[PDB]
Amino acid sequence: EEMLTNNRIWRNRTVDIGIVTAEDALNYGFSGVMLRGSGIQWDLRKTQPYD
Amino acid sequence: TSVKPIFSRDMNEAKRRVRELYRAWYREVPNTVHLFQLDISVKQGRDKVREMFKKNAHITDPRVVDLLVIKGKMELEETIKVWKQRTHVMRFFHETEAPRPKDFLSKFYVGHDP
Amino acid sequence: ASATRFIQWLRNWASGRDLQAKLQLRYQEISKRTQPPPKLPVGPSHKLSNNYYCTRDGRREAMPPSIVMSSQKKAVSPAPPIKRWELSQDEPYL
Amino acid sequence: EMVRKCDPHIGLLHRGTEKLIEYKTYLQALPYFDRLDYVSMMCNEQAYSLAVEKLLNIRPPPRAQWIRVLFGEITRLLNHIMAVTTHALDIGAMTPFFWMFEE
Amino acid sequence: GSDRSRFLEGKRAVEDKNIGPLVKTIMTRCIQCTRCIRFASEIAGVDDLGTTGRGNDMQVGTYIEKMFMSELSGNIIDICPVGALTSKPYAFTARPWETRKTESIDVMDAVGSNIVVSTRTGEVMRILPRMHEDINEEWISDKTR
Amino acid sequence: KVSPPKRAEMKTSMESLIHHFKLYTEGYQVPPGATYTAIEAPKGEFGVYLVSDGSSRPYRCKIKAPGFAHLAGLDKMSKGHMLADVVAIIGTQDIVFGEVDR
Amino acid sequence: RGEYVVAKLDDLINWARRSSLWPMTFGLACCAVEMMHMAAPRYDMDRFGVVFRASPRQSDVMIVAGTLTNKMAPALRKVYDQMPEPRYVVSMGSCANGGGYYHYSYSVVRGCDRIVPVDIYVPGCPPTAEALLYGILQLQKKIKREKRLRIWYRR
Amino acid sequence: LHHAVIPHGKGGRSSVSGIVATVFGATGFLGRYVVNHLGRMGSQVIVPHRCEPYDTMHLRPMGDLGQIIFMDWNGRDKDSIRRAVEHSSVVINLVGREWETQNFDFEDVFVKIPQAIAQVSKEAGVEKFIHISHLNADIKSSSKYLRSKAVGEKEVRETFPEATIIKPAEIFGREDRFLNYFANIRWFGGVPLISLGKKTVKQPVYIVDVTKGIINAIKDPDARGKTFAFVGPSRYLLFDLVQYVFAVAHRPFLPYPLPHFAYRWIGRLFEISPFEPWTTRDKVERIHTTDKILPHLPGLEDLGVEATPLELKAIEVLRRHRTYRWLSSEIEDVQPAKTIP
Amino acid sequence: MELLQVLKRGLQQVSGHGGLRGYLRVLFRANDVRVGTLVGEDKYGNKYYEDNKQFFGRHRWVIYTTEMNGKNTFWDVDGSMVPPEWHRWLHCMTDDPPTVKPPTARKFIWTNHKFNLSGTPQQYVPYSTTRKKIQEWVPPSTPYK
Amino acid sequence: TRPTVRPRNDVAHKQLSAFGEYVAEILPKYVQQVQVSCFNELEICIHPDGVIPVLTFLRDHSNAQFKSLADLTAVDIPTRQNRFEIVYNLLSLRFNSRIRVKTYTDELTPIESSVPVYKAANWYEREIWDMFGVFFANHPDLRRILTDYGFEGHPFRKDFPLSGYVELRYDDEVKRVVAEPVELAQEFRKFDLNSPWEAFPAYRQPP
Amino acid sequence: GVRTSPTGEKVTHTGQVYDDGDYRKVRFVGRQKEVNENFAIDLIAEQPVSQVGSRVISCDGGGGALGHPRVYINLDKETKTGTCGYCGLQFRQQH
Amino acid sequence: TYKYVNLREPSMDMKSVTDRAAQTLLWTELIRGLGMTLSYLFREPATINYPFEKGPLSPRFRGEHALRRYPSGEERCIACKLCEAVCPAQAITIEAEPRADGSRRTTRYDIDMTKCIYCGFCQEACPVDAIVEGPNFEFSTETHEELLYNKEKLLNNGDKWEAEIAANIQADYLYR
Ligand SMILES: CCCCCCCCCCCCCCCCCC(=O)OC[C@H](COP(=O)(O)OCCN)OC(=O)CCCCCCCCCCCCCCCCC
Ligand SMILES: NC(=O)C1=CN([C@@H]2O[C@H](COP(=O)(O)OP(=O)(O)OC[C@H]3O[C@@H](n4cnc5c(N)ncnc54)[C@H](OP(=O)(O)O)[C@@H]3O)[C@@H](O)[C@H]2O)C=CC1
Ligand code: SF4
Ligand code: SF4
Ligand code: SF4
Ligand code: SF4
Ligand code: SF4
Ligand SMILES: [K+]
Ligand SMILES: [Zn+2]
Fold it and tell me: G86 preceded by cis ω (within 30°)?
């Protein structure tokens, strides 16, 4: 995180890049971090847990 | 025998799509030879296209014809967009396959395959 | 572990962390490469009586699907609506 | 350098795994799942095992379930190290890859 | 059956018996079902097989040193449910799951017994009967086998 | 009848040897049925649609790879961006082609 | 004595070539992950002079690290042909060696040696990073044994 | 037939052709096509090589596992020849060199080595022997290369009376020293020619035709003891042939006359190179030698091969000799050469 | 001052390898000049060392012999030269070296270890280990016809 | 709660059964069968004409809200006259529930494309077309996705051989990769594994 | 023991050897035929017969769970020894 | 439970705004990143000196295959073909017949090491510990053919490696 998180070069390369809306993410069949990055509150370990 | 069509209501409409595909392939051969830098002539390329259509000339079901046309357009698009490489275009000519004589005696000498 | 005092200070200062407490190279804190033999336990079916397999046969309890409707009042949802998640109390905002 | 269209052509690593599995017993098919997401090996195994355990109508013992979650989360660490640091590697920051691949 | 054992004793062991060059006997595997005795008596018409002794020590065999050399003898390999009676020529050469079954006809005589030709990796491994009620039922002759 | 016995049991008990033999040759049979099972895999939802026909070999095994759907969305996500941004976007999807292609 | 001179010049060009093997940045499947671990600090392939370079024009070795499918085969042959010479091919893992787990598939090339000549086969599924390193050092010793100039002298 | 050599399969890579062949000189132009065609059908190929193993790597993909076998050999070590042929049913001799070297002259590679291979093969019970000579072989030739071919062809027919001797014209192909040789004259500007190439006639033959003729000779019982001449379908004037080469490659063609003594002098100039000479005096002679007409000998059609015209394959060899401007030009854009009817 | 102590430690390494010649030998053969405790030596001449203050992975190492099975290994060394009994200890599969925990002796275990023989005349060549399956009819050696 | 047996969940079984007949009541024009498995998975079997109406209803209805298409696949059953079974697996985040919708088609009958309902269905339908040869009408871009360029056949059909019909190698003469009829040095060894003794009486078919 | 054919090729413990005229032996020219020298048929014969005082003995190959499945051997015939079907060890009943 | 990864409003007071201006103009956060790589320069590297040093392994490691013997020298393998049946890759090929002394023994035992996935199922399935995966992983070859192991190769491997294999089995058999 020291190398990347607050690095302005890293933020320039990743901030506002590849924005997906919560609605598009659902209809396109996304899952995991691809849903949770857009604010969807979903994780199968919480909602449909296993072992 | 009431079945859902694909595109063509009957063989008359299907043969129209067949002719349209043949024109598209026929016009495309000159570009394919040029773009892929093939060592064959436009005449050989168009003879091969003709040979591919001819093998299916006996079909009478419009649905089967429609699927053959759908595949033909898919094949043509692969060629036009250079998704195919030269190896794919040349697989139609089977240049490395040795002759397999098709008379009873020749097969008898080589093995058990009918 | 062999770094001199000055070098330890230098990299501690540059990183801003006390790196000597959590070194990424392993030394003597790891488990020995030879270990005493184990003695693993057995499972609940290791009994000499009251243990007939027919009473603990999961595979033979499976049944064909229940036919609800075939072609041979309040509205319902598949399940109750999902409960809204709570904010973490360990660290709600990163 | 503006991207007007992306057309991913895949299949260059298509190996007919799903057809091969039809010729295997359930045990023999298990190693095929290591080689799907081959950075999350034990997580793919767990998904296949849960599916078979569901059709069999049996339950794995508690200690095995704790081991599976333990190595599932170790596997998540393996995956996220690979995901984050190669992501950074493509973007030009090559050094975190080396620190974290020792982990 | 159950999936485990609770038997904490030593097992019985039985001496094997030589009944000819076609059927190998590993009689410790015998489960005393008497199929072989009934087949030999009723189908093959040979009253040579029987049980000697009694109790847990009961043993299937010929008592004396005798060869079961009937033209239908090999069939007792098929009807023995266990590996007590097995084909000597076939011994150790294959496993059932790896064989390919070619349903065919016997030509060793004019009966036309229906057979299964078991092959593996391009080689004939053994001959089995094929059920045909109106021809050979489920038996073949030893020449066919 | 599902999990093989311990090696010591296999070498002492008749039932254990039979079950060891059968599990490593024929394998356990699964009752007929179909399930879609999914987990929270590190890359997203990873699931299998597993169809059993009652024997010891699956009839069909469809693998749902989270990256398959993600990569299908690459063209959507790359609109208005430059080449170097597509490099970043491929990475942010976290794609491994063992699962995308199978 | 020409024999002595060509022998020493062979040692020099061989030494220079094995001491500076630049594999092509080219990996296919799970075997490529172990190849990453050979570049990682524990093994540090770069300490042997072994350095990845993306362009085939600047590569000496192709490590086929993973399954080669029929769809990928023409591209693998293409980038191998575009490597200048001398060039070497290391086959890594069962898939590249002979098809491996996918040998009987309709879409897989049964061994990359049907497509390109192979100098070293590294067994394993995957070979450990150390196993791959053993294969690279085996390639180095193969290059050390080359007799290009001694054979030219006797032509 | 020994059970191990009864043909099996469908003539593919994993089949068994029944052919066990030792191919001497497999590491050259003609060798790579012969080995390719043998391995296509599942033959066992023994490849004795003098070169560095790096230079045999292109032969490795040509056969299924275990089907290409490499051995070391020396043209003067008769024991090494015996080791390479004692298990084979046919021996093919493709050894040759277009220039003399400090260690090997035309007599060594075209007389001594071919004789030694034939001698050891006969003593070892080898049943078939295919030897490549040259169409223009002649004891009266002004080229040492062609004089040694005539002598070597006589010695082979004596040591191994049942040998098949094949006499090809100049062979054209991707890795030839024929069409590629003419196309490479462009780096010197004009194209020198003795008598402006109007006194010479050539009948070049395609590499694949020669290859298929060799393979049919192995399988053809009638081919034993015969001598064939493999020629192309058309005869050309050397001037027309070179003009066609520069047209196909789209390079400027500036032929000028050079008398024989002048061409010879330059030939020696390039012979100084200790590597692979670009041209030699002997090479100049053979290129300007007229291709003999031998109606009495059987040809490619006798072995079932239909000769491939140069017009259909020149682009395949000569496309890489063009600049970027003309790379994509198609086969039909250049008009053919006048064929001597 | 520690910087003075560090120089002494590095200067000590020259004496720990028996002088500058031995120091330069290990520097050029193994690219490492550390001094460890001699755990043992195998019959081929490989010497095994440990230093438990080194981090895990660097705490055990081998200095390969200069000759093995008639091959000059002064410059050409490879991991396959380590014999099996030392292989386990070198890879940390066990804590005990074979000097302390000797392996069990069997009359069939190789007395002489072999390194990787690929690319040499001793390399392995595969072949079918089974005999001919079909026996062919041999015609008679006399003309009766 | 026997330790080796998977426990039942009757509450989920009841809830899914009630919703199953809820869907059957609302879409009687298309629903042919509704069943719930013993491990609580609901399947709606529909006429193929109902793909769009049924999938739209499950996505948009306030009591359904199946916003996510988890998976779309096909199964080949040669013994059926409509050999291809098309399977949609959907997820509802609102109700934390899953549902399976199944229909059928044959080699020559098109299925309406579900891309309008789920953009995720795009590549799934290309895969089904590629591996099974089922045509999807009104697909914006239907073509192979997994197989090699120019590949002939549909490998996931049960009558496509495991190793296919052609294989590739590099040929030095033509200086390119070529395709030739498949020959195997070692043929794949078919195993006959099924025991001749019935395993699961609960599933016995009537004779 | 490992014999040699009249051609000099060693005969394996399975009795394999390329015959005089089989081309396939060219694969060994310049290399070698891998042949394990310790023939297990000869090694097991070296073991002495074990004398036991019971009609039935059991064998597990030795080493407990490191051996083979435990089997019981009948020693009623005096004309021969009982042989373990797994490891080949031989047993006899003393008088 | 959940947490927000990126949802914080910066303070708009004069000191905070001037702290951010100094970071922007004087590159403070970039200088901090330089400190981290500097600290690594002075750390001992993680590299080991292969082949003089080796990466650690455990007794369970699955490497090159070997066919084992009993202490008497008899082969353990009795040609049951369980390993051949379970092999996920069909890499094992077996033929068997009665030996000259009547023993049940193989006449062919091939492992195609280019088919094998080194999964260890064969050694799990073996009832007599005949086939194992040994600890060797340094057997790369120069040719494909050298990786097609027949029974002679596999028995030589067992004889070559038995001393290590037996000690490894001893360490782990109570876990099996
Ligand atoms: C008496 C009155 C006197 C009057 C004169 C007073 C003058 C002094 C006060 C003025 C301020 C002085 C400092 C000016 C330095 C230049 C500042 C600058 O340009 O950097 C800011 C720049 C902004 O970019 P960003 O942060 O992304 O956001 C900007 C939004 N538009 O961000 C960047 O440029 C980031 C650069 C990224 C690349 C950095 C990679 C190297 C980093 C390490 C370098 C360390 C510095 C080494 C210097 C060595 C010099 C030998
Ligand atoms: N135009 C043509 O190409 C024609 C060719 N021929 C004949 O065909 C045969 C081969 O033609 P081509 O393949 O083009 O010739 P190449 O020069 O292309 O290949 C010659 C082969 O001979 C080997 N060789 C040469 N000298 C020696 C030697 N002193 N000792 C051992 N091996 C040696 C070479 O091995 P290395 O790789 O080690 O040099 C190479 O494999 C020759 O006999 C040639 O005369 C006949 C008519 C026309
Ligand atoms: S048929 Fe077999 S098991 Fe039954 S009594 Fe006869 S030998 Fe025993
Ligand atoms: S296979 Fe059957 S008869 Fe043979 S030992 Fe096993 S249970 Fe007994
Ligand atoms: S050999 Fe094994 S690890 Fe390597 S790509 Fe193939 S399956 Fe993956
Ligand atoms: S390790 Fe696995 S793939 Fe390899 S031979 Fe054993 S069972 Fe087969
Ligand atoms: S190695 Fe083991 S499992 Fe394989 S055939 Fe031999 S005894 Fe059976
Ligand atoms: K029986
Ligand atoms: Zn025993």
Answer: yes
Cα distance between residue H165 and residue H158, in whole Å: 12
Contact I3, I49 (CB under 8 A): no
Domain count, chain B: 1
The residues spanned by each domain of chain H are 1-341
Residue K32 to residues I118, I124, K29, Cα–Cα distance (Å)? 12, 7, 7
User: Which ligand is nearest to the Cα of residue L127, counting in written order?
Assistant: 7
Q: Is E36 in the pocket of ligand 3 (CB under 6 A)?
A: yes
Reading across the β-sheet that carries L104-112, which strands appear in turn?
L92-98, L104-112, L148-149
J189–L contact, CB cutoff 8 A = yes
Measured CA to CA, the distance from residue H121 to residue C83 in angstroms comes to 89
G95: annotated binding-site residue? yes
- Chain mean position to CA H310: 16
Which residues touch L168 (CB under 8 Å, ≥6 apart)? I88, I93, L59, L61, L134, L135
Is L126 known as a binding-site position? yes
Which atom of ligand 4 lies nearest, measured to the CA of E84? Answer: 3
What single-letter amino acid sits at L166? Answer: A
Question: Which residues span the domain enclosing B59?
Answer: 1-114
Q: Cβ neighbours of residue D67 under 8 Å, at least 6 residues apart?
A: none
Chains touching E (3+ CB pairs < 8 Å): C, F, J, K, L
Residue (of L10, A35, L153, L84) closest to K12 by Cα position: L153
C-beta E58 within 6 A of ligand 3: no
Q: What angle do CA D20, D22, D26 make, to 5 degrees?
A: 105
CA distance J34 to J28: 11
| Coil, strand or helix at E102 | strand
In contact, K76 and E15? CB cutoff 8 Å: yes
Q: Please indicate whether, in this complex, the C-beta atoms of H330 and B110 are within 8 angstroms of each other.
A: no
How is residue H289 written in tokens?
């030698």
E102 forms bridges with which residues in the sheet? E117
Three-state DSSP state, D38? coil
- CA–CA separation, D58 vs C59, rounded Å? 7
Full DSSP string of J125-172 = HHHHHHHH---EET-TT---SSSPTT--S-TTSTTS-TT-SEEEEEET
**Alpha-carbon span H274 to H272, nearest angstrom:** 6
The single-letter DSSP state of residue H38 is: H
Q: Which of chain H's residues have a Cβ under 8 Å away from the Cβ of I134? A: 3
Question: Which among H177, H188, H311, H189 has a CA at the least distance from the CA of H241?
Answer: H311
- DSSP class of J206: P
